[PDB]
Design a protein around this motif. Structure first.
Motif, mmCIF file in Angstrom:
data_model
loop_
_atom_site.group_PDB
_atom_site.id
_atom_site.type_symbol
_atom_site.label_atom_id
_atom_site.label_comp_id
_atom_site.label_asym_id
_atom_site.label_seq_id
_atom_site.Cartn_x
_atom_site.Cartn_y
_atom_site.Cartn_z
ATOM 1 N N UNK A 27 98.681 10.438 20.878
ATOM 2 C CA UNK A 27 97.252 10.299 20.606
ATOM 3 C C UNK A 27 96.439 10.860 21.748
ATOM 4 N N UNK A 28 95.747 11.954 21.467
ATOM 5 C CA UNK A 28 95.081 12.749 22.448
ATOM 6 C C UNK A 28 93.568 12.549 22.408
ATOM 7 N N UNK A 29 93.009 12.172 23.556
ATOM 8 C CA UNK A 29 91.576 11.988 23.723
ATOM 9 C C UNK A 29 90.834 13.266 23.431
ATOM 10 N N UNK A 63 88.983 14.929 26.860
ATOM 11 C CA UNK A 63 89.717 15.367 28.058
ATOM 12 C C UNK A 63 91.204 15.621 27.804
ATOM 13 N N UNK A 64 91.667 15.227 26.623
ATOM 14 C CA UNK A 64 92.956 15.627 26.123
ATOM 15 C C UNK A 64 94.080 14.804 26.707
ATOM 16 N N UNK A 122 89.502 13.631 14.351
ATOM 17 C CA UNK A 122 88.418 14.488 14.845
ATOM 18 C C UNK A 122 88.981 15.880 15.203
ATOM 19 N N UNK A 123 88.497 16.874 14.484
ATOM 20 C CA UNK A 123 89.051 18.221 14.501
ATOM 21 C C UNK A 123 88.647 18.938 15.811
ATOM 22 N N UNK A 124 87.490 18.570 16.363
ATOM 23 C CA UNK A 124 86.904 19.286 17.505
ATOM 24 C C UNK A 124 85.681 18.562 18.157
#
Ligand SMILES: C[As](C)(=O)[O-]
Ligand SMILES: C[As](C)(=O)[O-]
Ligand SMILES: [Ca+2]
Ligand SMILES: [Ca+2]
Ligand SMILES: [Cl-]
Ligand SMILES: [Cl-]
Ligand SMILES: [Cl-]
Ligand SMILES: [Cl-]
Ligand SMILES: [Cl-]
Ligand SMILES: [Cl-]
Lengths: 232, 231
Positions: free
Chosen positions: B9-11, B14-15, B203-205
């Motif tokens: 699971x990527x923020x 900030x990733x 959330x795509x972007x």
């Protein structure tokens, strides 16, 4: 056996006119209540469901005859749609569908055993199909008690082609601060408007509450007062 | 015929990897969630015991492999009608302080030995098991709110025992975002008022984030769309 019908007149909060009558199952109790365990027992046996269904459709037809000028709302749990008998009696009352609203309930009952082999996606498809059928017979379909039970926004979205009405019941949400609940009411009101659906808020205690809901941008809807159902 | 995937699971902003979600997959050429298979296992106590033993051991192997991270596992409410489920949550309890139990929105058929319970007694029995899991120190999240049976009424009933509510954009493709945004704002406020963590998945972007912010979704964890992979 253990069953009877009640009617609840649905009274407009602002002028008190009777918009429609809702039909309610009740037991033969001292103080009658919804017969939850008895209806579940009927839902779990095809033969009992057939007897129940014959009783209900005839009793309901007698009510229609007695009030021939009015709209009636009946409650049907989605799991009822797994029995063909349900659609058979909707078919037999179909000359009256122009004045009947089918409120699809939020209930999560055990699916009849002859349909338990279907996976969750195939079960939802089977139900959506039967809702299609009911719509095709010319019933108004309403989603009852939205944001309750299994009547989540996703489900409402799946039913969307076939529905005309979304109902939000304040009664199911006693412990939510109204200013917090108001954001969900505003969301469903906007949804209803965008989709040309009627939005009903039930369980409104007084006209005071109406104005309360009114400030915080819920513009278009029908409000119903809290009132006691009674024998038919 | 089952395997585990993981989805980092990527923020969105900030990733960084917030946690990993464990996902069930079949053994297909292209793996998918094994819906029919998991329902067949849920319908038979002996198979459910054998699946539970497989799952819990497989998941414990994962935990050992990544000892510094949080893991989210999905549990359908109907799995709580089997004592085996609480038995393996009990066995993994030394790790509960880094495990989130995501209660799914699934409506599976209830195991036969609990079908006699009326709908009210079934809800009380699940709520009691959720209390138990909370008692063991697991974080409990409600997955995919406003999907399946994870309606606002349900979330209200689970409330003492949860720390997180998750809203998944992926489940709502065909709703115009300006209409969807009012539901997101409602849940964002519900979370704040109840000191829950709010997660928006799918959330795509980064533009979507501005939208969410401009419409009162102030405090939430956003997660990017990404592909799960074998563990
Ligand atoms: C007057 As009418 C639309 O409830 O049949
Ligand atoms: C920092 As933590 C409670 O997600 O392991
Ligand atoms: Ca109703
Ligand atoms: Ca999940
Ligand atoms: Cl009823
Ligand atoms: Cl049938
Ligand atoms: Cl909902
Ligand atoms: Cl999973
Ligand atoms: Cl959608
Ligand atoms: Cl917020």
């Amino acid at each position: 056996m253990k069953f009877q019908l009640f009617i609840q007149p649905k009274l407009d909060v602002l002028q008190g006119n009777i918009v429609e009558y809702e039909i309610l199952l009740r037991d033969d109790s001292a103080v009658p209540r919804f017969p939850l365990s008895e209806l579940e027992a009927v839902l779990a046996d095809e033969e009992l469901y057939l007897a129940f269904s014959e009783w209900f459709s005839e009793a309901f037809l007698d009510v229609l005859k007695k009030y021939p000028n009015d709209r009636f709302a009946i409650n049907i749990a989605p799991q009822q749609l797994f029995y063909i008998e349900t659609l058979h009696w909707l078919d037999k009352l179909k000359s009256e569908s122009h004045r009947i609203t089918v409120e699809m309930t939020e209930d999560i009952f055990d699916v009849p055993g002859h349909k338990r082999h279907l996976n969750a996606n195939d079960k939802n498809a089977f139900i959506l199909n039967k809702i299609k059928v009911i719509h095709g017979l010319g019933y108004h379909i309403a989603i009852d008690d939205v944001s309750c039970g299994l009547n989540s926004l996703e489900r409402v979205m799946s039913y969307l082609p076939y529905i005309i009405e979304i109902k939000f019941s304040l009664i199911h949400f006693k412990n939510i601060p109204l200013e917090d609940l108001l954001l969900f009411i505003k969301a469903w009101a906007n949804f209803a408007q965008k989709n040309k659906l009627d939005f009903v808020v039930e369980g409104i205690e007084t006209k005071e509450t109406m104005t309360l809901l009114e400030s915080h941008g819920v513009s278009i809807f029908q409000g119903y007062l809290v009132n006691k159902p009674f024998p038919v």
